């Protein structure tokens, strides 16, 4: 079927992970990766993030009922962290 992948990303020198997001509970569209910036941290980790990946958890947090702006803040918040690491549980088709 579809399946879950856990992806761990450390941001680059500018604090960017290298992907774009669309969706959120206010957008009436699920949260989904709309871009992978080539050679970015999100493109070079193993396993890597893919365009079209559906975001399920952000650092363990179920984000199904959070807004677009909220989840962008949750992602930025992972840089101000223990390991600076962002952990994305995603769903892939």
């Amino acid at each position: 079927d579809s399946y879950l992948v856990l992806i761990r990303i450390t941001p680059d020198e500018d604090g960017k992970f290298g992907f774009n997001l669309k969706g959120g509970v206010d957008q009436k569209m699920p949260l989904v990766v709309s871009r992978i910036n080539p050679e970015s941290p999100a493109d070079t980790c193993i396993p890597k993030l893919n365009e079209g990946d559906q975001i399920v958890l952000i650092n363990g947090r179920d984000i199904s009922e959070h807004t677009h702006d909220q989840v962008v803040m949750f992602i930025k918040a992972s840089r101000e962290s223990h390991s600076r690491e962002l952990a994305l549980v995603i769903r892939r088709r």
Binding site: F17, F19, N20, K22, D26, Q27, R35, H68, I75
Partner: peptide, 8 residues
């Protein structure tokens, strides 16, 4: 807008 796209 309900079609926002944000860079992370």
């Amino acid at each position: 807008s309900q079609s926002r796209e944000s860079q992370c």
